[PDB]
Amino acid sequence: VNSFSGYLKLTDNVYIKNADIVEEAKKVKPTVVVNAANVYLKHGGGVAGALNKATNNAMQVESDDYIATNGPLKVGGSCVLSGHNLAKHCLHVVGPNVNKGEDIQLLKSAYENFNQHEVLLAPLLSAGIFGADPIHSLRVCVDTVRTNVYLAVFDKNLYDKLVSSFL
Ligand SMILES: O=C(O)C[C@@H](NC(=O)c1cncc2c1CCC2)c1ccc(F)cc1F
């Protein structure tokens, strides 16, 4: 039993809700919140810009130190950093950005990072300003993640479309 409330169950291990991931994180304080990161951990917009704003820019300060030490992530890769006031940990995961020409096959590799964590709160990788089809992102998620994932979809219209079209 966990504290996630109001989710629709899609499969044995995947759940979905129309919610602002920022507000959902502040209430649940999950062990792991997933960020829709880029390789530079520049949290300017989308989910990343919103999460970073909620930390009063502390996520960005920590991220800049991480990059100065380690260099950029790989597309499809991840790193674990602090969750600040939102969660114990933040798993920064880089899905391919279609508006940059990155290979969509890398989306499965990106979701594989979730399997290193028993329970996560997450957005749909490569959705939104990353330019991929969110319906496809949900399919790859369900077919790749085996741990317990709670998906927050900001747009109510998109949430309804994702549920109504889910196979
Ligand atoms: O933001 C992403 O990277 C991906 C995804 N974000 C969220 O669902 C989300 C969840 N919680 C809080 C917030 C967001 C967005 C900003 C604040 C997304 C958003 C809108 C859209 F039209 C498509 C889409 F895929």
Numbering used by the authors: 3 to 169
Direct quotes from the study:
X-ray crystallography-based fragment screens have taken off in academic and industry settings. To assess qFit-ligand’s ability to detect multiple conformations in event maps, we took advantage of ongoing fragment-based drug discovery efforts through the UCSF QCRG Antiviral Drug Discovery (AViDD) program to design inhibitors against the severe acute respiratory syndrome-coronavirus-2 NSP3 macrodomain. We identified previously published and new fragments manually modeled with multiple conformations (n = 20). We used these as a true positive dataset to determine if we could identify multiple fragment conformations in event maps using qFit-ligand.
We created a modified true positive dataset (n = 20) by removing all ‘B’ conformers and setting the ‘A’ conformer occupancy to 1.0. qFit-ligand was then run but with an event map, rather than a composite omit map. In this use case, qFit-ligand models alternative conformations into an event map, which represents only partial occupancy of the unit cell. Therefore, we scale the output ligand conformer occupancies to estimated occupancy from the background density correction prior to merging into the full system. Following this scaling, we perform standard refinement and note that the sum of occupancy across ligand conformations is a refined variable that can be <1.
